[PDB]
Design an enzyme around this catalytic site. Structure first.
Site, PDB file in Angstrom:
ATOM      1  N   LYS A 141      11.597   5.355   6.465  1.00  0.00           N
ATOM      2  CA  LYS A 141      11.515   4.131   7.253  1.00  0.00           C
ATOM      3  C   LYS A 141      11.307   2.888   6.404  1.00  0.00           C
ATOM      4  O   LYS A 141      11.816   1.819   6.755  1.00  0.00           O
ATOM      5  CB  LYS A 141      10.373   4.232   8.269  1.00  0.00           C
ATOM      6  CG  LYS A 141      10.538   5.361   9.269  1.00  0.00           C
ATOM      7  CD  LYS A 141       9.323   5.497  10.173  1.00  0.00           C
ATOM      8  CE  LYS A 141       8.149   6.158   9.465  1.00  0.00           C
ATOM      9  NZ  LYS A 141       8.421   7.585   9.151  1.00  0.00           N
ATOM     10  N   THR A 142      10.568   3.002   5.299  1.00  0.00           N
ATOM     11  CA  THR A 142      10.360   1.851   4.428  1.00  0.00           C
ATOM     12  C   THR A 142      11.671   1.383   3.808  1.00  0.00           C
ATOM     13  O   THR A 142      11.923   0.176   3.706  1.00  0.00           O
ATOM     14  CB  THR A 142       9.348   2.201   3.338  1.00  0.00           C
ATOM     15  OG1 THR A 142       8.126   2.645   3.941  1.00  0.00           O
ATOM     16  CG2 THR A 142       9.066   0.995   2.456  1.00  0.00           C
TER      17      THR A 142
ATOM     18  N   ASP B 119       4.344  -2.376   6.438  1.00  0.00           N
ATOM     19  CA  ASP B 119       4.665  -0.958   6.460  1.00  0.00           C
ATOM     20  C   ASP B 119       3.392  -0.130   6.372  1.00  0.00           C
ATOM     21  O   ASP B 119       2.397  -0.547   5.771  1.00  0.00           O
ATOM     22  CB  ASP B 119       5.604  -0.590   5.312  1.00  0.00           C
ATOM     23  CG  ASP B 119       5.139  -1.140   3.984  1.00  0.00           C
ATOM     24  OD1 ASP B 119       4.081  -1.803   3.955  1.00  0.00           O
ATOM     25  OD2 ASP B 119       5.829  -0.911   2.971  1.00  0.00           O
ATOM     26  N   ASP B 120       3.439   1.054   6.975  1.00  0.00           N
ATOM     27  CA  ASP B 120       2.291   1.952   7.044  1.00  0.00           C
ATOM     28  C   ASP B 120       1.103   1.242   7.692  1.00  0.00           C
ATOM     29  O   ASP B 120       0.052   1.029   7.086  1.00  0.00           O
ATOM     30  CB  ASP B 120       1.933   2.486   5.653  1.00  0.00           C
ATOM     31  CG  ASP B 120       2.416   3.908   5.429  1.00  0.00           C
ATOM     32  OD1 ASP B 120       2.477   4.684   6.407  1.00  0.00           O
ATOM     33  OD2 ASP B 120       2.731   4.253   4.271  1.00  0.00           O
TER      34      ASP B 120
HETATM   35  N1  LIG Z   1      19.818   7.021   4.192  1.00  0.00           N
HETATM   36  C1  LIG Z   1      18.581   6.952   3.689  1.00  0.00           C
HETATM   37  N2  LIG Z   1      17.590   6.491   4.481  1.00  0.00           N
HETATM   38  C2  LIG Z   1      16.352   6.418   3.986  1.00  0.00           C
HETATM   39  N3  LIG Z   1      15.918   6.746   2.767  1.00  0.00           N
HETATM   40  C3  LIG Z   1      16.917   7.199   2.006  1.00  0.00           C
HETATM   41  C4  LIG Z   1      18.246   7.330   2.375  1.00  0.00           C
HETATM   42  N4  LIG Z   1      18.999   7.833   1.325  1.00  0.00           N
HETATM   43  C5  LIG Z   1      18.124   7.988   0.362  1.00  0.00           C
HETATM   44  N5  LIG Z   1      16.847   7.626   0.703  1.00  0.00           N
HETATM   45  C6  LIG Z   1      15.665   7.686  -0.148  1.00  0.00           C
HETATM   46  O1  LIG Z   1      14.708   8.466   0.533  1.00  0.00           O
HETATM   47  C7  LIG Z   1      13.376   7.986   0.234  1.00  0.00           C
HETATM   48  C8  LIG Z   1      12.760   7.570   1.543  1.00  0.00           C
HETATM   49  O2  LIG Z   1      11.323   7.619   1.409  1.00  0.00           O
HETATM   50  P1  LIG Z   1      10.387   6.652   2.233  1.00  0.00           P
HETATM   51  O3  LIG Z   1       9.203   6.253   1.448  1.00  0.00           O
HETATM   52  O4  LIG Z   1      11.226   5.490   2.762  1.00  0.00           O
HETATM   53  O5  LIG Z   1       9.978   7.530   3.484  1.00  0.00           O
HETATM   54  P2  LIG Z   1       9.011   7.379   4.737  1.00  0.00           P
HETATM   55  O6  LIG Z   1       9.434   8.219   5.874  1.00  0.00           O
HETATM   56  O7  LIG Z   1       8.875   5.886   5.023  1.00  0.00           O
HETATM   57  O8  LIG Z   1       7.629   7.860   4.133  1.00  0.00           O
HETATM   58  P3  LIG Z   1       6.128   8.128   4.589  1.00  0.00           P
HETATM   59  O9  LIG Z   1       6.072   9.249   5.568  1.00  0.00           O
HETATM   60  O10 LIG Z   1       5.379   8.418   3.286  1.00  0.00           O
HETATM   61  O11 LIG Z   1       5.657   6.791   5.155  1.00  0.00           O
HETATM   62  C9  LIG Z   1      13.593   6.775  -0.671  1.00  0.00           C
HETATM   63  O12 LIG Z   1      13.702   7.298  -1.988  1.00  0.00           O
HETATM   64  C10 LIG Z   1      15.000   6.326  -0.286  1.00  0.00           C
HETATM   65  O13 LIG Z   1      15.572   5.770  -1.460  1.00  0.00           O
END
Ligand SMILES: Nc1ncnc2c1ncn2[C@@H]1O[C@H](COP(=O)(O)OP(=O)(O)OP(=O)(O)O)[C@@H](O)[C@H]1O
Ligand SMILES: Nc1ncnc2c1ncn2[C@@H]1O[C@H](COP(=O)(O)OP(=O)(O)OP(=O)(O)O)[C@@H](O)[C@H]1O
Ligand SMILES: Nc1ncnc2c1ncn2[C@@H]1O[C@H](COP(=O)(O)OP(=O)(O)OP(=O)(O)O)[C@@H](O)[C@H]1O
EC number: 3.6.4.6
Lengths: 523, 37, 40, 213
Positions: free
Chosen positions: A332-333, A386-387
């Site tokens: 999501k970030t 975020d978060d």
């Molecule tokens: N289509 C995509 N959408 C999102 N992230 C992607 C995509 N392709 C690759 N990535 C990579 O996946 C990772 C996403 O991790 P991110 O920190 O955004 O996850 P999160 O769900 O927000 O985490 P958390 O649960 O820790 O809050 C990043 O390295 C991003 O570069």
């Protein structure tokens, strides 16, 4: 002369002309139609004050300037300081008496004048030697007998220590600030110092002085001279070899050409600008780019585009907010940062808890307030948080959280910016079952959903876009995942792919499938 | 209310006035010795 | 003590000079007066 | 009569190479090309590090190789005096022979070395203290004026060492006054071997070291 450059000075052309206009105009102007006595200079160390003093002394056809090297007037005997100080103006007074208003101009140099002039002497001086000395100088320069054939120049590296009493009219009339030169000034200084090189064609044509002028940032003249000297020293030492004894070829010595490599080595290795550097780290929030493993990404990006368009072109909705919901490890970030980047607004910032470790509630509130206040200055801006659940640190036990930060957020979410300005807010969170309880989900205007990988086709497409497995490996993966459910986040998928490439090729697919089965589940 | 401090001191040789000039009275004594002789 | 000793000696000899030369002048004046009175 | 082997410094090989490159390159080179290049020699060296690696040994050995006059030493803050305006009288007495020989022998003067030991005791930031006397400010101002003033003095070399680099006032460390500044630190395996070899040469000379070492 008025060349402004023949004296080997650069960057002060405008101030040099202003000095010409304001200092010597009366002397230049014809006596038929018809002064300045106090000149003060100041600036950071290494700017060219002494060069200005020397050239000013040389320029005018007058007597040789007198100089005092710091506190050379103090003495251990009572009354000797005053005698030494009064010894200076005997010639000035005599010339005044002899020639009326025709007396020749006199120059007195007070180098490092801060040593004498200060806010009174300390109580433990045993007397008023400092105060009496400064009073004697003030009376002599500003006595009842008013002369018109003396000019005094003062120079200091710290103006704040000079007593204000000496800066009033009739004592110190002109004040000059010497600052950091400009890119054109850097080019001019380089040209002046490399004229000697170019005279004998000892400089390699591979050097582009423009590139150097671009590279050197926050360099004074002294630092640039040091850089040039270091380059010359490296070029000279390339031809010397002194480990057993000092020795030089004396045959392959004529070439002695300084190359661009020498300048680069001198800049990188043994020079420092002596100024801080600005840090930019916003590129670290997207470490793997965005790959369209499915349709939902397109919908999310389209909705973000529509929201940006609405906030830009709206009239009576200056503030708009959106929420980004989704399960954990769903990325999501990254999408929020991408949508913020695509906006191309003048002002963008990211507020994250990574930079607030050990902070209490008040510090967090102050930091968020500062960031929003800064955002309230541009014409149209976007801000992202975020978060959230980690911002108001929340724990399922109790539960427990921070009330002050929650109230700060709820207040800031519905405060319009000043007249005729636009602000956008994007918030991200993984657990939406709690924000609805706190009543914080009603403030946001709308919410967007971010799903997980839910079908084998999408998993295989993501694998292809990553490019790790092939042939029978992918075929077997398909055969085993064409009738089964898959629930994996992209980040977890990357972690698993990294995990399963550590054993021998025979066991890779089996290990990967075992890990996928173990981590697989259903909602 | 922070307080309770100290200090250091210096001096100055203020008796700069010379005294050797008035102490060279020997020649007058020599002349009067010649007179007594 | 290098410079410190040099200055201490200078000032001590200066106080000495003062006192000793004053005393010597006083003695010279005493002898002068005695001889002048004797000649009569 | 000089050679790096004779010097007892071991484990500091890059530092000496850098110092020689950036300090004595100009003087060794034949005068003609130097004049054709129109460059000014360095007038300062600063050394710093944690307590005890090579500082004083390096300074002494550097001062003991040049075929110049004997260097002038200053053990700590022995410049201060209790009379008004007399620290300066002691400061200026150091840069005295240099100006005289500059006046006499034109631009062929020898080299004069001054070694300031524990330079952080005298030259602190101006106006830092809140004491009842102001002698330190005048001392610093006089030193700054004399090291590089309106009158050009270009036959000196000043070396300084300390254990706290950050206390020195910035005005004393701009290129021209004290430019080449170096950091001496802990050695590594090769450095340790070199040091232990330097300190164990004489015993092995006369077979005072057992074969099993
Ligand atoms: N289509 C995509 N959408 C999102 N992230 C992607 C995509 N392709 C690759 N990535 C990579 O996946 C990772 C996403 O991790 P991110 O920190 O955004 O996850 P999160 O769900 O927000 O985490 P958390 O649960 O820790 O809050 C990043 O390295 C991003 O570069
Ligand atoms: N703009 C400049 N043009 C030419 N040379 C310069 C310039 N700025 C600095 N320099 C060089 O730096 C030195 C100038 O310093 P100078 O001795 O004239 O006094 P200053 O800069 O006032 O010193 P301080 O650092 O003690 O305040 C000289 O080497 C001069 O060549
Ligand atoms: N690299 C070295 N090679 C050979 N001998 C060394 C080396 N380093 C230290 N020594 C020995 O140890 C002594 C350490 O004293 P030294 O003069 O180097 O101290 P310093 O660095 O001036 O100390 P301080 O911490 O007080 O500033 C040297 O005199 C020499 O005897």
């Amino acid at each position: 002369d008025w060349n402004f450059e023949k004296m080997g000075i650069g960057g002060l052309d405008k101030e040099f002309s202003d000095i010409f206009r304001r200092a010597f105009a009366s002397r230049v102007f014809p006596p038929e139609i018809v002064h300045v006595k106090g000149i003060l200079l100041y600036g950071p160390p290494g700017c060219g004050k002494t060069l200005l003093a020397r050239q000013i002394g040389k320029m005018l056809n007058a007597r040789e300037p007198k100089v005092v090297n710091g506190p050379e007037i103090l003495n251990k005997y009572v009354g000797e300081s005053e005698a030494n100080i009064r010894k200076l103006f005997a010639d000035a007074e005599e010339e005044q008496r002899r020639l009326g208003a025709n007396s020749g101009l006199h120059i007195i140099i007070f180098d490092e004048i801060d040593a004498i002039c200060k806010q009174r002497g300390s109580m433990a001086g045993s007397t008023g030697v400092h105060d009496t000395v400064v009073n004697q100088l003030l009376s002599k320069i500003d006595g009842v007998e008013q002369l018109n054939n003396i000019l005094v120049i003062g120079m200091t590296n710290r103006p704040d220590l000079i007593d204000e009493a000496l800066l009033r009219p009739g004592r110190l009339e002109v004040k000059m600030e010497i600052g950091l030169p400009d890119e054109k000034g850097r080019l001019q200084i380089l040209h002046i110092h490399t004229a000697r090189m170019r005279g004998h064609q000892l400089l390699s044509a591979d050097v582009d002085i423009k590139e150097l002028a671009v590279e050197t940032k926050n360099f004074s003249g002294a630092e640039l001279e040091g850089l040039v000297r270091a380059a010359q020293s490296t070029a000279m030492n390339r031809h010397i070899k002194a480990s057993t004894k000092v020795e030089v070829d004396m045959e392959k010595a004529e070439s002695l050409q300084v190359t661009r490599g020498d300048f680069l080595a001198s800049l990188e290795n043994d020079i420092k600008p002596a100024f801080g550097t600005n840090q930019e780290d916003y590129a670290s929030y997207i470490m793997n780019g965005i790959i369209k493993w499915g349709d939902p990404v397109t919908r999310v990006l389209d909705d973000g585009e529509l929201l940006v368009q609405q906030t830009k072109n709206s009239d009576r909705t200056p503030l708009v907010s959106v929420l980004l919901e989704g399960p954990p490890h769903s990325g999501k970030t990254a999408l929020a940062a991408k949508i913020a980047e695509e906006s191309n607004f003048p002002f963008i910032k990211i507020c994250s808890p990574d930079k607030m470790i050990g902070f209490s509630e008040t510090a967090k509130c102050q930091a968020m307030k500062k960031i929003f206040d800064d955002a309230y200055k541009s014409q149209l801006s976007c801000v992202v948080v975020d978060d959230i659940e980690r911002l108001l640190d929340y724990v399922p036990i109790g539960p427990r959280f921070s009330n002050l930060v929650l109230q700060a957020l709820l207040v800031l979410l519905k405060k319009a910016p000043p007249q005729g300005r636009k602000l956008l807010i994007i918030g991200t969170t993984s657990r939406k079952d709690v924000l609805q309880e706190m009543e914080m989900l009603n403030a946001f205007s709308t919410t967007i959903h971010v799903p997980n990988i839910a079908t084998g086709e999408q998993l295989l497409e993501a694998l292809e876009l990553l490019g790790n497995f092939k042939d029978k490996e992918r075929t077997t993966i398909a055969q085993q995942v064409k009738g089964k459910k898959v629930w994996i986040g992209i980040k977890k998928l990357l972690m698993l792919i990294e995990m399963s490439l550590q054993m021998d090729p025979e066991y890779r697919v089996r290990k990967f499938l075992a890990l996928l089965r173990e981590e697989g589940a259903s909602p | 209310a922070s307080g309770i401090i100290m200090d250091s001191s210096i001096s100055k040789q203020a008796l700069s006035e010379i005294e050797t000039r008035h102490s060279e009275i020997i020649k007058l004594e020599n002349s009067i010795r010649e007179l007594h002789d | 003590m290098a410079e410190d000793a040099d200055m201490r000696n200078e000032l001590e000899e200066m106080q000495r000079r003062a006192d000793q030369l004053a005393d010597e002048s006083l003695e010279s004046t005493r002898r002068m007066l005695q001889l002048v009175e004797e000649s009569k | 009569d000089w050679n790096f082997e004779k010097m007892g410094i071991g484990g500091l090989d890059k530092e000496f190479s850098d110092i020689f490159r950036r300090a004595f390159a100009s003087r060794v080179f034949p005068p003609e090309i130097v004049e054709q290049m129109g460059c000014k020699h360095v007038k300062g060296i600063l050394l710093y590090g944690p307590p005890g690696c090579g500082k004083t040994l390096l300074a002494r050995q550097i001062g003991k190789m040049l075929n110049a006059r004997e260097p002038k030493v200053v053990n700590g803050p022995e410049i201060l005096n209790k009379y008004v305006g007399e620290s300066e009288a002691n400061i200026r007495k150091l840069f005295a022979d240099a100006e005289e020989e500059q006046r006499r022998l034109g631009a062929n003067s020898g080299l004069h070395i001054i070694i300031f030991d524990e330079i952080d005791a005298i030259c602190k930031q101006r106006g830092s203290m809140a004491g009842s006397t102001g002698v330190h400010d005048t001392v610093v101002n006089q030193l700054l004026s004399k090291i590089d003033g309106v009158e050009q003095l270009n036959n000196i070399l000043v070396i300084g060492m300390t254990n706290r680099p950050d206390l020195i006032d910035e005005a004393l460390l701009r290129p021209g006054r004290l430019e080449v500044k170096m950091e001496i630190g802990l050695p590594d395996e090769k450095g340790r071997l070199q040091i232990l070899h330097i300190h164990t040469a004489r015993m092995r000379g006369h077979q005072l070291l057992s074969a099993d070492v």
